[PDB]
Amino acid sequence: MRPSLSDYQHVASGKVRELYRVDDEHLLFVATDRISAFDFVLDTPIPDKGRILTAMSVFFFGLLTVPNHLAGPPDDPRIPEEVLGRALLVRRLDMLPVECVARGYLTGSGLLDYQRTGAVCGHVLPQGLGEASRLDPPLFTPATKADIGEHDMNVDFAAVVGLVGAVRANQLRDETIKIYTRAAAHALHKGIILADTKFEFGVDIEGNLVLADEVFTPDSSRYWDAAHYQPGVVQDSFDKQFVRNWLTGPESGWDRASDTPPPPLPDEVAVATRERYIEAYERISGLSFSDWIGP
Numbered sequence: 001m002r003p004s005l006s007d008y009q010h011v012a013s014g015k016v017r018e019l020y021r022v023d024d025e026h027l028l029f030v031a032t033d034r035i036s037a038f039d040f041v042l043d044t045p046i047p048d049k050g051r052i053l054t055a056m057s058v059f060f061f062g063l064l065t066v067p068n069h070l071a072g073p074p075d076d077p078r079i080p081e082e083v084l085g086r087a088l089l090v091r092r093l094d095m096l097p098v099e100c101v102a103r104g105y106l107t108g109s110g111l112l113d114y115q116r117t118g119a120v121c122g123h124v125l126p127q128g129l130g131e132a133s134r135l136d137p138p139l140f141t142p143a144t145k146a147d148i149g150e151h152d153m154n155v156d157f158a159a160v161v162g163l164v165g166a167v168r169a170n171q172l173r174d175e176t177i178k179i180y181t182r183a184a185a186h187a188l189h190k191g192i193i194l195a196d197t198k199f200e201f202g203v204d205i206e207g208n209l210v211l212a213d214e215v216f217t218p219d220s221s222r223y224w225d226a227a228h229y230q231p232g233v234v235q236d237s238f239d240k241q242f243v244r245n246w247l248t249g250p251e252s253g254w255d256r257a258s259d260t261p262p263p264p265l266p267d268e269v270a271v272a273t274r275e276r277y278i279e280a281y282e283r284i285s286g287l288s289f290s291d292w293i294g295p
């Protein structure tokens with residue numbers, strides 16, 4: 001018999017994920033079906049999104065050879081029935097206060113920083129780059145979390161040194177770029193560009209660096225369709241473009257420049273979005289989502 005979620009102490013909530021204490025050395029890392037668009041958590045959940053993203057993360061943890069925080073299988077008996085398939089048993093780490101971002105392509109705040117200054121996180125880039133330009137080598141573009149309201153703040157390597165130590169900063173940079181490169185090549189071979197990605201790391205009792213949080217989900221990474229990659233214009237979000245298009249289209253009745261909370265999504269947009277997540281997962285993993293565990 002699996003424990004109830006109510007048997008565990010809630011210790012943290014994010015926009016779409018939750019964290020629970022299991023015991024002194026383990027946590028329960030829970031994905032919900034919530035989806036964020038335009039910095040709003042939307043009213044409408046995407047069915048099975050939590051399970052699909054958990055499956056994705058587990059696949060990539062298995063693909064990478066680096067130590068990670070997984071502490072049991074996806075069907076570990078410590079996982080409650082209610083969150084089966086969308087929750088992982090993980091080792092408690094001392095988390096390092098750095099958002100470890102790799103960018104293989106120039107978009108979002110990386111592009112904006114470049115357009116304003118010619119540089120991103122201390123990297124002075126070639127002239128003539130633009131939206132969705134390929135970066136080679138990939139850039140380490142670290143960030144720090146800001147207040148409840150603001151977006152993460154881009155920082156340079158010196159800031160990372162000041163946060164975690166000189167040798168540790170080098171390690172974060174090198175590991176971030178190495179594992180991004182591996183995952184990006186894998187995905188591209190399957191027809192998906194991972195344009196960028198965000199990692200969090202922690203340290204275990206021995207001082208070892210351990211990859212944590214979630215890895216290479218479409219929430220932590222920009223997924224693009226490689227078959228439609230066209231430098232110079234904004235690439236469609238593989239998973240979220242239907243949501244984006246509807247919210248900013250003629251049917252929603254919502255003005256994005258209002259910063260008022262957006263309206264609920266049509267059921268068929270939510271179902272279509274679920275299908276995009278499943279397609280991304282199956283293409284990348286070579287596995288069938290119908291085989292992924294659930295309640």
Ligand SMILES: CCOC(=O)Cn1cc(-c2ncnc(N)c2C#N)cn1
Binds near residue numbers: 091094095202
């Ligand atoms: C609610 C969603 O936000 C987070 O979970 C971010 N976060 C992660 C930790 C963490 N803390 C100790 N050990 C870990 N293995 C982890 C992980 N993953 C804390 N906040």
